[PDB]
Every structure is written in structure tokens, then in C-alpha cells.
Write a structure and sequence with these properties.
The structure is a homodimer of 377-residue chains. In chain A, 29% of the residues lie in helices and 25% in strands. Chain A has 377 residues and is an alpha+beta fold. Chain A has a 4-stranded mixed sheet with strand order 1-8-9-10, with helices on one face. In chain A, strands 6-3-2-11 form a 4-stranded mixed sheet, with helices on one face. Chain A is flat and about 60 Å long. At the A-B interface, strand 1, strand 2, strand 3, strand 7 and strand 8 of A face strand 1, strand 2, strand 3, strand 7 and strand 8 of B. Bound molecules: potassium ion (3 copies) and magnesium ion (MG) (4 copies). Chains A, B: Pathway: Amino-acid biosynthesis; S-adenosyl-L-methionine biosynthesis; S-adenosyl-L-methionine from L-methionine: step 1/1.
């Protein structure tokens, strides 16, 4: 049965992602000196201005302004006519610094309550939903061709959205593609459209999926010349859906960026991705979404729920059985199981936290053990 | 088949909700003078400090500092020992003001791309999921008993989470309840727990649902005395899931607060709630989630998807049929169909945007017409 589904992504240099990237840049910087730092670094950015504000508890000494400017310069906003200059914008910080003051550390309780969801599905090579994968892949391609001289008239800010038609569970093809890229005053729109079509759209979208019917809307309102923080406003924790799964799977509140791994909102979501991905790699189901919840000061999750949507290859209680035997889902367990106390986070902040294989939560190392506990199959 | 599901809510006075409420307070204030104002007002709040920052385009003259202080005073933070004083905190603003510069206005195109989701289900009186309804109802009850002198030792900030067990589609009862409330130094924990149990928990939770087994965790870490912005950080658009449906139904990125109705992220979500709620009130299904998407400069939604999860009482294409005949889903159509150009928004900003009947998107006025177009049934 036909039905269409859509997912959006934005690039590095879309304002809320600038803010995401700076928080995580500060997180890494601290983690490099003090892996057990507690950070919650929220960032706000607007036409003149980056305000990076937080509570931090750490040994580390880190330079917020230096870190802030470097990150805006990598993204590329480096001149007033772009909208924003990394070397002249204002950086304000308001980070309250605290300096650090049960028998098994693995039994320490959750830092806060929360619900968090992880998903996988055999739709893609990376076990992620196809729409959000392609939406991410279009925006990456844009920053790539921008940065490697190919189409050097394009500026940082860009949004993408791809809408997929499915018959029963099966991708059929791509109904509509939208891509809007900031560009210099040098190029104009007809020529721009050729260029994005040749160099961004056609090398990323599987041709089998694109038809005579694929409605492409490249720069629909025309001229996108000033962008980024100029005339707009970005805050960490806004591209929350993009980060995740483009709306295919669910979400509890929580933002990831600027939070160190004590923060279940981040870690438990990463671990839930890891359980679901290992479940589908083991061929226990085709699609799997799990919800995990916690309560403040309790170590055991208050709930685990696995939804294999009528796609299981073992009955479901037997699936929740091995979810528990193979995975330490306690806050400090998570941290152990995925070795998170490391500066790996700025990379997360742009094109999807998930589906990107070299991250600790993407490895399918528990695959077989799950399979051969699932009876043996 | 058993399975547990959880949803979280926070009160007015939880920091990200303070920020939500101030944005919407500014929105209303402008709407009162200029209904066609374009506002996108983002707010950040931290221990000393409220920064309210935006792009606005309007006739209206409005006092941001006055609006900011009044809203913090209604929430109740009015003395340094609470954590934050409305009459002494710093208000900074950075609102760029623009003064206002096709044949059928209903055909004007979408302001941005986006995906947005609406849900309903016959689980509750208000056609909303039971967990997020009760989670909201606990936090309301807290602010209510706080504000009406009953338990006047309690301070603004509070979080709630309720975890529900379901057998097949059917609520069975409440497995765990967590409630953590800020309180004065006057009361201590044993007495506090009685009070929340008597006056907040027991009058809100259906007794039939609570058992010998209901794990209640009231103030699990004990002493919550300073809260709100003190020592923490709130930004608009963070309690995005709470606003919605507690993680039962999906979400595209978008925050609601501080955005005027031109912003599809808000309006289309409100309209999608309205379609799904009218579909279930008409007895066309038991549960209905719809996704709507848009592209910048196009008026027709790029996709509509209806998921009645095997609960339909008419085949599904016939459901999407009447979704289109009964509802103008074009950006300016939405605005017409729900009469949004009015200062009704601050109320939205606290305890759920949905499930609250006196809002334009909650009325089931299209109920019958849907039913008797659905064949006649
Ligand atoms: K954060
Ligand atoms: K958010
Ligand atoms: K907003
Ligand atoms: Mg945004
Ligand atoms: Mg959180
Ligand atoms: Mg928060
Ligand atoms: Mg948006």
C-alpha cells in the first residue's frame, strides 16, 4: 500500500547547527583534558552574536572565545557579506564553573528522568531510514563541494528535504526533492540549478528511485545570498529530529549537544540505537524501535519497550529477554558498554548522530551473540 | 500483549518552559495590536538572566522588559532564595524589528519547508494519549495547589513522569509515577511526600489504575530547594515532546512558541491535530497519526500521510480522500480554518498545546460531515 513520508536535514552553518557544533566543540575541548567533566553547554547565536552559556564542573581550563571562533571559521562564515564573520562576531560566555568536590560505580543512579528512543531498519546499508539518510547525504554533499573548490560560489547555509513513496514497507522511489543553498551574488539562479543538479543531487540520489515524476525544487524562492545567523537565530537542541531519524521513529525531549555522557538524554539514546541496530543486524527483526526510561536516583531503567513492528523472527518477550542479557542499560553501564569518555562529539553535531558507522553506538559487534541466544538461528 | 510506555511533563517555572511562556507572551502582546505581525521570538534564560531575541516585523510597539518581568512574576520567581527574582533579574533583548513593507491570498506559498505530525486516539476523554495527559495533569495540579495556598511551601519548578502498562491497545494501569517538586526550606521530605501524595497524586490519578505495585518516586533525590533558572538553563523549543504527545506520536523538528501563525512548524501541526482529532471523533478510526509536509514557496502540501494503525472503519485511501475534501491544508488556508490571528498563545506555552478543548484546533466541529461522507455510517 502506497504512502509518502518526508524527512528534512540542514547543513553545518544552518544557525541551530552552528549552535550545536559550538556546544560539542566546547564539550570535546574539556573532555580532552578531563574525561569525567560534567558539561551542559547551551549556545544561542543571532546576527552579531554567539552567547555560549552553561554549567560546567571540571578541572579543565578551556578558551570559549577561541573555540567559538574556530568553529565558525571551519563552517566558513568569515566576512560580513556572508552574513557573519567568525573573526569579528561577539562571543559572550556565561558558564558557571564548579570545580569537582555507592560501592559499585556501575550502580550509580540516573542523573535525571527521561524517555529515549532508538531505531533501526533494514531499509539502508547503515540500518537507518532511507529519507533521513538521503536528506543528510544531500546537505553533506553541499558542504563537501563547497569546501573542495568544485562549486566555490556556494555559501554555508542550506536545507534539504526528500519525500519518499513506499508501498508495503518497500521504498518505491523519490516523489519530491527540495534543496535550498546560500550562494554568492556571483552566480544566478538558472546556472545555480544546473550546478546543484549535476554536482549535489545526481551523485547522491539512487537513479532507480528518481523518475520522470520527481518534483525537484532547487532554491524555490530564488536568491539565497545572506544566511547563517544573519537575520535569523540558532539555539542548541533545535535540530533534534534531524539528528535522530527524520521523524520515522519517535523521540523523548532531549537534545544531545553540549551534554557530556552522564546525561541520559544523550547516552541512553545512543545505547538504544546500539541495541536496536544490533537486534536488526542479528536478523531478529526488520525494523525495531525501543523506548527506555529512567528516574532520578534509580539505576535500573523504569521501562524498556521493544517494538518490532510485526517483523520479529523470534517472539517479542524472547526479544526483550535478550535486550536485558546483552546490554547494561544502567547510566554508568551505558558509558562502559560504549566507551564514551572521549572527545568524539563535535563530529556528531552535524550530519546525523546515527547511521555513521565509526561511532561507538553504530558497531554491530554484539550481532552474533544476540542471534545465537535467540534460540540458535 | 503487555508493554510499558512512558511520558514526562514539567511545570511552568521549569526553565525551558519559562522561556516558552515568555516568547508566547511577547507574541500575544504584539498580536493584540497587529494580528498580521510576523514574529519569531527565541528566549534564553540562565541564573541572572533572560535574553529575549528575535526577528519581528510589525507595527506594534511592545515592552519586552515589562512583558518579561510580568511573566516571571506569574510563574512565581520573586525572591533571590527561590533562585531567581522577576523584579531584579536582567532582561536583555535583541529583537531586530522590520516595519512592514498572488491573486488569491489563500494560495500564498509556505514560509519554509517542514514535516509535522498530529495524533489522536480514543484512549482519553480529550482524544489524547493517557500518559502525557496524566503527566500534564500532575504538573498542573502542583502549580494549582502551589498557587491557591493549599500547599504554599512548594516553589515553581517541578517534573513529572508516568509510566503506563498496556495490554493490546488497552491501558491496564500505572506501573510507576515520579514527581519532583521544588519546595521551601520550611518543609522536609517525609512530610512533603505525604502532602504530594494526598494533594497532587491521589486526586489526579485514576484509582483503578494504581495498585499495590505502583512504584511511586516522589522527590527521589530529596531536597529540591533552589530551582528554575538558578544553576540551570532554559531555551524556547526544548520541551517540544511534552508540548505534543509525550513521545506516543512522532514530531518533525519544530518548536511552536515564539512563532506567529505564518510559521507552518506551528500552524500545520495545530491543523494536523485538528484533522486527526476530527477523524477519530467521527469514528473513522481509533488512533490516527497524520504527517503533512511543505516546500518553501509551494502552497499545496508536498505530502499528506494518514496512519490509522489497523483501526480504520473505512479503507484508508477513502480516509485520505476526505482528509483533503474537508480541510484546507494550505498555509493560509490553515489560518482561515482555525482562526488563528488572535492573542491566544501564552496559554499554549505551559501544559500541552493539545488536549485542552477550548483551543481552536481541539474542536470537533467537522465530526459529522466526515462521518457521513465516509460512506454514511
Ligand atoms: K544541551
Ligand atoms: K527541541
Ligand atoms: K521559536
Ligand atoms: Mg530554527
Ligand atoms: Mg532533558
Ligand atoms: Mg532543558
Ligand atoms: Mg523550523
Amino acid at each position: 500500500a502506497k504512502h509518502l513520508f518526508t524527512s528534512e536535514s540542514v547543513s553545518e552553518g544552518h544557525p541551530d547547527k552552528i549552535a550545536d557544533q559550538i556546544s560539542d566543540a566546547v564539550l570535546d575541548a574539556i573532555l580532552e583534558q578531563d574525561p569525567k567533566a560534567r558539561v551542559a553547554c547551551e549556545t544561542y547565536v543571532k546576527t552579531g552574536m554567539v552567547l555560549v552559556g552553561g554549567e560546567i564542573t571540571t578541572s579543565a581550563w578551556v578558551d570559549i572565545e577561541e573555540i567559538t571562533r574556530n568553529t565558525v571559521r571551519e563552517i566558513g562564515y568569515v566576512h560580513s557579506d556572508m552574513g557573519f564573520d567568525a573573526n569579528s562576531c561577539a562571543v559572550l560566555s556565561a558558564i558557571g564553573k564548579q570545580s569537582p568536590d555507592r560501592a559499585d560505580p556501575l550502580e550509580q543512579g540516573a542523573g535525571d528522568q527521561g524517555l529515549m528512543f532508538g531505531y533501526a531498519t533494514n531499509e539502508t546499508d547503515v540500518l537507518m531510514p532511507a529519507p533521513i539518510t538521503y536528506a543528510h547525504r544531500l546537505v553533506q554533499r553541499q558542504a563537501e563541494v563547497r569546501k573542495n573548490g568544485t562549486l566555490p560560489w556556494l555559501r554555508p547555509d542550506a536545507k534539504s528535504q526528500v519525500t519518499f513513496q513506499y508501498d508495503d514497507g518497500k521504498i518505491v522511489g523519490i516523489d519530491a526533492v527540495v534543496l535550498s543553498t546560500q550562494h554568492s551574488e556571483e552566480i544566478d539562479q538558472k546556472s545555480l540549478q544546473e550546478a546543484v543538479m549535476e554536482e549535489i543531487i545526481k551523485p547522491i540520489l539512487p537513479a532507480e528511485w528518481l523518475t520522470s515524476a520527481t518534483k525537484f525544487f532547487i532554491n524555490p524562492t530564488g536568491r539565497f545570498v545572506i544566511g547563517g545567523p544573519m537575520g535569523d537565530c540558532g539555539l542548541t537542541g533545535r535540530k533534534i529530529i534531524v539528528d535522530t531519524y527524520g521523524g520515522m521513529a519517535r523521540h523523548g525531549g532531549g537534545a544531545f549537544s553540549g551534554k557530556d555522557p552522564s546525561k541520559v538524554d544523550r547516552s541512553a539514546a545512543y545505547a538504544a540505537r546500539y541495541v536496536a541496530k544490533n537486534i536488526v543486524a542479528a536478523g531478529l527483526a526488520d525494523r525495531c524501535e525501543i523506548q527506555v526510561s529512567y528516574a532520578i536516583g534509580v539505576a535500573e531503567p523504569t521501562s524498556i519497550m521493544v517494538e518490532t513492528f510485526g517483523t520479529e523472527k523470534v517472539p517479542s518477550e524472547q526479544l526483550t529477554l535478550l535486550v536485558r542479557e546483552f546490554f547494561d542499560l544502567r547510566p554508568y553501564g551505558l558509558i562502559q558498554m560504549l566507551d564514551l569518555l572521549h572527545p568524539i562529539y563535535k563530529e556528531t553535531a552535524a550530519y546525523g548522530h546515527f547511521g555513521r558507522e565509526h561511532f561507538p553506538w553504530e558497531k554491530t559487534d554484539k550481532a552474533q551473540l544476540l542471534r545465537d541466544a535467540a534460540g540458535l538461528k
